[PDB]
Design a protein around this ligand. Structure first.
Ligand SMILES: *[B]([O])([O])[C]1[C][C][C]N1C(=O)[C]([N])[C]([C])[C]
Ligand SMILES: *[B]([O])([O])[C]1[C][C][C]N1C(=O)[C]([N])[C]([C])[C]
Lengths: 134, 846, 846, 138
C-alpha cells in the first residue's frame, strides 16, 4: 500500500490467477487506489491477497439474483488474529435513499458454504470489520 | 349503476397481451427453482470431522434447467449471528438425464402426468441408507451410485454408473432390496423384474404379460398400479419389497420376498385417446373404468426367490393366497396401500369397498401364500401344508357414512413384546370427522382355519378385537396424511412427528406428540408460515420447505436440541438454510386472506388479489378463480406466485381476483368435505357466489354486473355450473378442461363422491353440466371452453359432448384447444397462449 | 374513407340470428325436394293400352320423409296446350326404408359419406330389365320386386319381397346377375357373396377376409373399392358381373363369371378416427394411405361358379392371372374402373400410375385367369394349359404431362365382324386438353406368350397399334365424363348421345353426334339452362332435370321425334313434366353471373349475390365464398338455392357474396385445371383477389376494407391462403374443414395434383398453411376455424395441427367443433348452428 | 475462506440500488479504422482487470475520460447516443448496467467511429425519465 512508507508496489506472482502479495513495514495503511480496499494492522508481516471470482461460488447458491455483488471478493492469507481491520469497497448508496445500514450482510465464504455475518459499520465507500478477518 | 365509476380495463392488442404475459415470466424463472425435496439425512460418525451430516436431495442448480441429485454438508457447529446457506454440491458429473426436447416414453409420460411432475430429469429416486445406494431413472435407463457406505464421502462429483439391460422397453419403478443392497427390482413391460447391481444378472418374476398387441388383448399386469389407483388413490407402485431376509435352511439360500398386486383388467372398458405424436394420427388404448363399470380384478401375490452367498438368483417362485383374493376378501374393490411390517412377519394392506365407505387393514403372513401351479392337486397339497394357525388378521376397520379418504399412515410397531398383539399408529378421520393419529393395539388370536376346503367369510370374519385405541390427537383440525404427507416415529424417544393444521387450516405445521402418553402436542415450526417438513432418521434435525402468502418458499434446516431426558420439548433452533426467499416478481402484490361465515354458520376462507393501483370509488370487474372440488385447498398461507401468477397478472391489469374454499374442500375435516356428497356442483357454486357477495360488501371495488368464473379440471365444471345456475351473477365463464358428464368419469373419484349412477341418478343428472345446456346463455361471448386434446384424465369427450349438446340446444360458445397438452398446460408457449387468450376474452367480453 | 358511406350490417342477437336462419329453411320442404333421379324406362307393348312406357325412379313426395321407389306412366299421346304433370305413385307399400333418427350401419354410413348421399331411405337400386327385378337396400335388409316379366304390370302398390340371410352383418353392394336373373351378388364383410332369389340359397365366393379383429390384423378384402378409390377415383364397387353366360358342356352347367379386385391393404398406414358414438369413446381404424406412403396392393381376379338348370350353385372357383398382377402390370397403382364387354369376351380395366399421368385400358380374357392353388405344380400345369395366343391387349394408353382425370366413358362395340380388332368409344382429355369423345379402332394381334415361365413387360409390351382414332367432338369445351355423367349409344341409328359444355361452360347440355360420320353436334336441350339428362334404352325419350341461376329446378320429359331416315335431326318435343320449378321466394334473390379476364388473359366466371335492398353509394362488406380446388364448379347457370341458401341469407342481411371460379377448376379443360399443378394455394387465391377487385370496379358496393373469405374443404384451405398471403385484402377468414397439411392428405387426390412430398417438397411446404402460421394475423377476430370432429376425409388432425402451430407461433384463433359431423354438416341443427355462428362472426368482426 | 462484500436488496421491494459504476472506452491506433467499445460496467478493479487483459489481447487501449458525477441505477435500460449517432454505426439501441462476473466477457456497446477525430460527444440516457447522468468529450 501507499501508506506512510510511500508506494509499496504489489509484486505479481501470476497475472492469470490474480494473486498478489505485500510486505508492509509500518503500522496502519492507506487505501490502495485501484478500488479503495484497505486493511490496517500494527506491525510488519507478510500477507497475500487473492481476488476470487463469484462465478463458481455463486453457481453453488441458487438465488444468486437475490444478492447483488458490491465488490471484488478478496481472500486474505495472513496469520490469523494479526489483522485488525479490513475495508471492502462498498458501492455508494448512502448518498441516495431507501438503503439501510442495519440491513447490510457480509459474504464470508467457506467450504461449508455462505456465511452471512453482519458487517460492523459502513462508510461512504467502505465496510469495516473487527479483528477476526479470516 | 353509474357507468363513469366502473373501472374499464385497458384494451391491449394481442401482441401487447403477449408482451405482458412474457413480461410476467421474465422474473419468474428465478422465482421457481424446484427447490430441495426428497431429503435423505446420512451421518458421518467421525467425531473429528467438520460436517455432522450429509443432506441428499433433488434440486436445480443454476447451470442446468433440470432436476438432479445433489447434497449439502451439515456442519457440527455453525457460528452465531451468521446465516449459513448451504452450497448445493453435485453428486453426478453434470450429465444429461433427460431425452431430447423433454420427450419421454409413454409409461414415463403417463407416470409424470399422474404424479404432476412438471419438472424434467431425476424426479423420483430410491436410497438405501447403510450401503448408501442411489438407484434412479435417468434418460430412459437406470443408474446408480453410492456415497459413504463401505466406501466414503466424496467431494468432487462422481459420474453415475449405468445399469445395462437385456430387456426391451423402459424400466419403471426401481426399488432397492432393503435386506440385500446388491439386489434391486423394477417393472418392465407390466411385469415385475429383479436384478443385481454387482453381477448385472436380471430375472423376471411374474409371467402374466406377453407384449402381444394393445391392452385389449393382453390384459394382466403385475406390480403396476393402474390408472384409477394412480389418479385417485395416489399410489404409483404395486410392488413392495420385504425389508428382511428369510433363510430357508436347505443349504445356505437367502429368501427375499416381494408382495405385488396382480390385476386382470380384461373386463374393464377400453377408451382411445389421441397419442402425443399428432402426425401419426393414432391413439392409445386406455383401460378406463367408468362409473358403474368394472374396475380391474385385483389380487395380492408373493414373488419369492432365493440366492447364493455369491448373489445369484438360483430359484424363483410365484405364490398366491390359499383361496382367491376375491373369495377370501369379498367386497374388496381397491387395494389403496400395502407394504410390510419392519421385521418382515406380516405384509399389511389397506382394502376398500366399491362405495369407498369401508376401509380395512389386513395382515398377510407369507405362509398364508402357497405357491401356484395349474395342477389343483399340488394346490391342495400345499393347502394341506399351510399351518392351521396362520391366517389373515383384520387389524383395523374404518366404516363411514360419508367416504373413506385413503390415509397412508400406518406404522406398526415391533411385536417381540409378547408375540401377538399388534400395535400400530393409524390415522382415522372417520371416527371424529377429522384425521387424527391413534395408537391402536389389536389382538391377533387365531381362530383356526381348514385352508384346504373353501369357506366363505362372514361380515366380521377375520376382524380382530381391539385392545385399545388411544387418540394421540383430537380437535377441529387434521393430521396431514394424503398427498404424500407422512409421520416420523422415533421409537427410542417414543415420539411421533406429524404435520397438521392445528394452529389454523391455512398453515401446515410440524407437530410432535408422544405415543406412550398422549400429552400436549408441540409445534416445531415457526407460526405465520406453512411448512413442508422432513425429519432425519436419527431425529436430531429436520428440513422445512416453507412459505407464506407474502414470502416465497425458502428451505431452512432446523435442529432439535435440548436435554435428552425430555425429548418432546427439544427446541428446534435454526441451523442452516438451503434455499432463500427469491425476491418477488415486479408489480407482484400478494393476495389478502380473509374468512367469512355462510348463512348456515360455517367458516369459509378466501383470497383476493386487489386491482393494482386501486382508485377507491371504481368498481372493477372480477375474475372468480375457482377449483372448489375436494383434495385441493387454494386458500392457505403459502406462496401463490408459482402456480397462480396469472391471478396476479389479472390483478395488475385491474381485475379483482377472488378465490373461495367452498364446502367440500380438503383439510377442514370429513363433515366439511362431506357437504357435497351426492349433490356435487350444487353447494360449491352457492358458496362461491356467497363469497363474492361477501367480498362485494366488505370491499368496495367489485362490479357484480362484470363477474367471470374460471378454473380448470373441477374449476371448469364449476364455471359451467356458475353460468347455468347464476347467469345474473357470472357475466362470463372460462371453463378449462371441464367434467361435463360424471357418468363418463372414473370410479375412484366419482363413486367416492357421487356414488354409482344406478343409485344417485338424480345427482348424476343434476350435476352433469352437459345435460343442462338449455340453461346456458342464448347470447354469445359468455362462455369460453378450453381443453387439452390429449387429456387422458378429463377426456376430450367431455368438452366434445358439451359442444355437441350446445349445438343441439342452439347455444354459442368459444373454444380453444391445446393439441399437445394433456391436463395441465405444461408447455410454456401453450401456457402463454392460454393466458393471452384469457386476458383477451376478459378484456373484450367481461 | 367516407365516414358513413360504408354499410353497417344490423347487429342481431344470437336468438335473432337463429330466427333468421330458421326462417330461411321454412320453404326448404318444397325447394330442397331431392328431385327425382335414377330413371329407368320400360316398355309395355300392349297394342290396346293408354300408356306407352313406365318410368321407374327414386323420389320423395314428402308424404313420407324418405326416398323411395316410384313410377310414372308415359302416355302414347298428350294433349296440346296443357301442362301435363304426372302424379308420383308408389311402387312399394309405404314402409319406412330408413331406421330411427336417420342412423345407419358401419360401412353403409361411410359409403353414403363417399357418395355424398344426404338423403335417407332407398338412395340406390339395381334394375334388371327383362325380368323387371328391382333389387334394393332398405334399412337393415335386402329387397326385390318385379314388374311385367312373365308376371304383370302392377297398378296398386305391391309389398317388397324380403331376401333372408344366413350371413351376420350387412349386405353391401347388391347387383343382379345380367345373364341369369335368379342370381344376384353382394358384399358381406369385405367378401363377395352370391345368392339366388327363388331358392334363397347363398354362397360365398372369396375367402380373403376372416373377421379376426379390427382391420389392423385382417387386411385382405375382395369386391370392395377402398377409401382412396372411393373418395378419389369415384368407384364404389370392386366387382363386376359378366353380362353373358358361358356353357362348359360337362353336363348342363351354366357358368357365370365375376371380375373382382383383390386389395392387400396390409402395408398401408392405419389411422384412428373417433366413432359416431362419442359416449363409447372408441375410435375406428382406417386404412388411410398418406401422401408418400404406400397404397393397397391390388389385383384382378375372376370368381366363377356354375349352376344346374334348376338353379343351384353346384361348383365354385376363385381364379387368378397366370402371372401376378404386379408383375404382368408393373407401375399400375390404381384400378380406376373395370368391367366387361357386352358380349362377354373380354373384361376391361383402366389402370393408372403413381404420378397419375399414365392411364391405360386393358382387356383381360377369362382364359388369361387360371384357377388358384397353393400347389405350384397345379399352377404350372394350368399355365401350360393356357393357349399360347391368348394374352392381354392394351387397347388405349393415355399419357399426359399434367394429370389423368378418370373418365368413365369407354363404350366397346360388338366384335362379331372380323374378330381381330376392337372398336370402342373413349373420352380423351389428354390429346387436345379438353375431354372429347373418340371412336378408336385398335388391332388385337396376339404376339404369342409362354405363360408358364415369367417375364417383365416393356413400356410398350401389350400395347396394341391403333387402326384409327377419329375425334367425334373437338373444340374449347368438353364432354362430361366424370361425376357419373355418361354416354348413351344407339347402335341401330349409330348415334351417341352425350352431355357437354359446348354452348358455354356454365350449362350442361345434351348433345348428339354420329360415331360413323362425325358431322355436326346437335343440341337437344333448351339453352339458357343446365341439364342432367337420362335416355331410354330404346332411345325414343329422355328425362332432363334442369335449372338455371334464376329459375328453381324442374324435371321435364322430352321425346325424340322426327323422320326415321335421319335420326340425328330428330326433334326433341316436350312430352310431359314430372316435377316443376317451385316458388322461387321473394326472400331469395338469385345471383348474377359474370365473367372477366385476368391480366394473363384467361376468362374466369363468377357469381355475385347483391345485398338486398341496395342503396347505391353505400359500400357493403363482402363474403367471398370459395372452393377453388379441382373437380368442382361453383359458378354455372343452375339453381344455387338448395346447397347455397346461406349465401342468399348473407345477401339478405346485406353482405355482398362473391363466388369465383379461379384457375384449376373443373369443366374448363386440362390446361385450365392444370394451372395450380404442383403449386396448390399459390394461383387460386391470386385469381380470387383479382376477381374480387374486378367485381368491385364492375359493381359499386364492395368495401375492400371489409372482406371475408369463407370456404369449406379446399375452401377453408384457401381461406387460410387468403389470410396468409393477402391479409390486406381479406379482413377475416372463416376456414371450414381445411387441409392445413398436404403431406397428411391421401395419395389419390394430392399426388395427382402435387406429385409427392419427396419430389415436390418446395410446393408441399409452400402450400401447407400450417407451415406458414407466422404469416397469419397477430390481431384477433380475423380467423375462425371450423371442423367436424369425425371427419374421415379431411381429418381433424389438420385443424389440430393448425391450432398447434397457432399456439406455437403465438397467434389467436376462434374455433368451432361439430362433434357428430364428418366432412360436411349433415344435421340440420348443426347446420343451423353453423350458419348462425357464421352470421355472428361476420356481424361482429367483419 | 473467501471474504468479500455483497448487498442483499430487501425482498419485498425492488429498490434499484445505485452503484459507483464507471463506463469506459477503448481505441485503436494501429489498424485501418477505429472501433470504440463502451463497457457499461460496475466500477470494480477485478472487472477492470478482466476488461484490461481481454483488451490487451485484443490490442485495445483505454484513455482516461471523466466518470459520471452522480450514482446511477442498476438494471435500468440506458439508451446510448452521441453527436455521431446515426452517421456512425452504434451497435445497440439500449444497454444494460447489470453486474456480470469478470470471467465472462462483459456486455458492451460497439461504436465504429472511422476517423479518430479531434473531439467527439457521447451520451448515455435513462429510459425511465430521460435525465442526463454522463457526458465525455472524447
Ligand atoms: B380434475 O379435478 O383434475 C379431475 C376431475 C375430478 C377429479 N379429477 C382428477 O383429476 C383426479 N381424479 C382427482 C384426484 C383430483
Ligand atoms: B375437400 O375439398 O372436399 C377435400 C380436400 C381435397 C379433396 N377433398 C375431397 O373431399 C375429395 N377427395 C375430392 C374428390 C373433392
Amino acid at each position: 500500500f501507499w501508506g506512510p512508507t510511500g508506494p509499496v508496489a504489489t509484486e505479481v506472482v501470476d497475472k492469470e490467477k490474480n494473486l498478489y502479495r505485500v510486505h508492509f513495514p509500518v503500522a496502519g495503511s492507506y487505501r490502495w487506489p485501484n478500488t479503495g480496499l484497505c486493511f490496517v494492522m500494527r506491525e510488519a508481516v507478510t500477507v497475500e491477497i487473492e481476488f476470487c471470482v463469484w462465478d463458481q461460488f455463486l453457481g453453488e447458491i441458487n438465488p444468486q439474483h437475490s444478492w447483488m455483488v458490491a465488490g471484488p471478493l478478496l481472500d486474505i492469507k495472513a496469520e490469523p488474529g494479526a489483522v485488525e481491520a479490513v475495508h471492502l469497497p462498498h458501492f455508494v448508496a448512502l448518498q441516495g435513499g431507501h438503503v439501510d445500514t442495519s440491513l447490510f450482510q457480509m459474504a464470508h465464504f467457506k467450504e461449508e458454504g455462505m456465511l452471512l455475518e453482519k458487517p460492523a459499520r459502513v462508510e461512504l465507500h467502505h465496510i469495516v470489520l473487527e479483528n477476526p478477518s479470516f | 349503476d353509474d357507468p363513469a365509476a366502473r373501472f374499464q380495463v385497458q384494451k391491449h392488442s394481442w401482441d401487447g397481451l403477449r408482451s405482458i404475459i412474457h413480461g410476467s415470466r421474465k422474473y419468474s424463472g428465478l422465482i421457481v427453482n424446484k427447490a430441495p425435496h426428497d431429503f435423505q439425512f446420512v451421518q458421518k460418525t467421525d467425531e473429528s470431522g467438520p460436517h455432522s451430516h450429509r443432506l441428499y436431495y433433488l434440486g436445480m442448480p443454476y447451470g442446468s434447467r433440470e432436476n438432479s441429485l445433489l447434497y449439502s454438508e451439515i456442519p457440527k457447529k455453525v457460528r452465531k449471528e451468521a446465516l449459513l446457506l448451504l452450497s448445493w454440491k453435485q453428486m453426478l458429473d453434470h450429465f444429461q438425464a433427460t431425452p431430447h426436447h423433454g420427450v419421454y416414453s409413454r409409461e414415463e409420460e403417463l407416470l409424470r402426468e399422474r404424479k404432476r411432475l412438471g419438472v424434467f430429469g431425476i424426479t423420483s429416486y430410491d436410497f438405501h441408507s447403510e450401503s448408501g445406494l442411489f438407484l434412479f431413472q435417468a434418460s430412459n435407463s437406470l443408474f446408480h451410485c453410492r456415497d459413504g457406505g463401505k466406501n466414503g464421502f466424496m467431494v468432487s462429483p462422481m459420474k453415475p454408473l449405468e445399469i445395462k439391460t437385456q430387456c426391451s422397453g423402459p424400466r419403471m419403478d426401481p426399488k432397492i432390496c432393503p435386506a440385500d443392497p446388491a439386489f434391486f427390482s423394477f417393472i418392465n413391460n407390466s411385469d415385475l423384474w429383479v436384478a443385481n447391481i454387482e453381477t448385472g444378472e436380471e430375472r423376471r418374476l411374474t409371467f402374466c404379460h406377453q407384449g402381444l398387441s394393445n391392452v385389449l388383448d393382453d390384459p394382466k399386469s403385475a406390480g403396476v398400479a393402474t390408472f384409477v389407483i394412480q389418479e385417485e388413490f395416489d399410489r404409483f407402485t404395486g410392488y413392495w419389497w420385504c425389508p428382511t431376509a428369510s433363510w430357508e435352511g436347505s443349504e445356505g439360500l437367502k429368501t427375499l420376498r416381494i408382495l405385488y398386486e396382480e390385476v386382470d383388467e380384461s373386463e374393464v372398458e377400453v377408451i382411445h385417446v389421441p397419442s402425443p405424436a399428432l402426425e401419426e394420427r393414432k391413439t392409445d388404448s386406455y383401460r378406463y373404468p367408468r362409473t358403474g363399470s368394472k374396475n380391474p380384478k385385483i389380487a395380492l401375490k408373493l414373488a419369492e426367490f432365493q440366492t447364493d452367498s455369491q448373489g445369484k438368483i438360483v430359484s424363483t417362485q410365484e405364490k398366491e393366497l390359499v383361496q382367491p383374493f376375491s373369495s377370501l376378501f369379498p367386497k374388496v374393490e381397491y387395494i389403496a396401500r400395502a407394504g410390510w411390517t419392519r421385521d418382515g412377519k406380516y405384509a399389511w394392506a389397506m382394502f376398500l369397498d366399491r362405495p369407498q365407505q369401508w376401509l380395512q387393514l389386513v395382515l398377510l403372513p407369507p405362509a398364508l401364500f402357497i405357491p401356484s401351479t395349474e395342477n389343483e392337486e399340488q394346490r391342495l397339497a400345499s393347502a394341506r401344508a399351510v399351518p392351521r394357525n396362520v391366517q389373515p388378521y383384520v387389524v383395523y376397520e374404518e366404516v363411514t357414512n360419508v367416504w373413506i379418504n385413503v390415509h397412508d399412515i400406518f406404522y406398526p410397531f415391533p411385536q417381540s413384546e409378547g408375540e401377538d398383539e399388534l400395535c400400530f399408529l393409524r390415522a382415522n378421520e372417520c371416527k371424529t370427522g377429522f384425521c387424527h393419529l391413534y395408537k391402536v393395539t389389536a389382538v391377533l388370536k387365531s381362530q383356526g382355519y381348514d385352508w384346504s376346503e373353501p369357506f366363505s367369510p362372514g361380515e366380521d370374519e377375520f376382524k380382530c378385537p381391539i385392545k385399545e385405541e388411544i387418540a394421540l390427537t383430537s380437535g377441529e383440525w387434521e393430521v396431514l396424511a394424503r398427498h404424500g404427507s407422512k409421520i416420523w416415529v422415533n421409537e427410542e424417544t417414543k415420539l411421533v412427528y406429524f404435520q397438521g393444521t392445528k394452529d389454523t387450516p391455512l398453515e401446515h405445521h410440524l407437530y410432535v406428540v408422544s405415543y406412550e402418553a398422549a400429552g400436549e402436542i408441540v409445534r416445531l415450526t415457526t407460526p405465520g408460515f406453512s411448512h413442508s417438513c422432513s425429519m432425519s432418521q436419527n431425529f436430531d434435525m429436520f428440513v422445512s420447505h416453507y412459505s407464506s402468502v407474502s414470502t416465497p418458499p425458502c428451505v431452512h434446516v432446523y435442529k432439535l436440541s435440548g436435554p435428552d431426558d425430555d425429548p418432546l420439548h427439544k427446541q428446534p433452533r435454526f441451523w442452516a438454510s438451503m434455499m432463500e426467499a427469491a425476491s418477488c416478481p415486479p408489480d407482484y402484490v400478494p393476495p389478502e386472506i380473509f374468512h367469512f361465515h355462510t348463512r348456515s354458520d360455517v367458516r369459509l376462507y378466501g383470497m383476493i388479489y386487489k386491482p393494482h393501483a386501486l382508485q377507491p370509488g371504481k368498481k372493477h370487474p372480477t375474475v372468480l378463480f375457482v377449483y372448489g372440488g375436494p383434495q385441493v385447498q387454494l386458500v392457505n398461507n403459502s406462496f401463490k406466485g408459482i402456480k397462480y401468477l396469472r391471478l396476479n397478472t389479472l390483478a395488475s391489469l385491474g381485475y379483482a381476483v377472488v378465490v373461495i374454499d367452498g364446502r367440500g374442500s380438503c383439510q377442514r375435516g370429513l363433515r366439511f368435505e362431506g357437504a357435497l356428497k351426492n349433490q356435487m356442483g350444487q353447494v360449491e357454486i352457492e358458496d362461491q357466489v356467497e363469497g363474492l357477495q361477501f367480498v362485494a360488501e366488505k370491499y368496495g371495488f367489485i362490479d357484480l354486473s362484470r363477474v367471470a368464473i374460471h378454473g380448470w379440471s373441477y374449476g371448469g365444471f364449476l364455471s359451467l355450473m356458475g353460468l347455468i345456475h347464476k347467469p345474473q351473477v357470472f357475466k362470463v365463464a372460462i371453463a378449462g378442461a371441464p367434467v361435463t358428464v360424471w357418468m363418463a368419469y372414473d370410479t375412484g373419484y366419482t363413486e367416492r363422491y357421487m356414488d354409482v349412477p344406478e343409485n344417485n341418478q338424480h345427482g348424476y343428472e343434476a350435476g352433469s353440466v352437459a345435460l343442462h345446456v338449455e340453461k346456458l346463455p342464448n347470447e354469445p361471448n359468455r362462455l369460453l371452453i378450453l381443453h387439452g386434446f390429449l387429456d387422458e384424465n378429463v377426456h376430450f369427450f367431455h368438452t366434445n359432448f358439451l359442444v355437441s349438446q350446445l349445438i343441439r340446444a342452439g347455444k354459442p360458445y368459444q373454444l380453444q384447444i391445446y393439441p399437445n397438452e394433456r391436463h395441465s398446460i405444461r408447455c410454456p408457449e401453450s401456457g402463454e397462449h392460454y393466458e393471452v387468450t384469457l386476458l383477451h376474452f376478459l378484456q373484450e367480453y367481461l
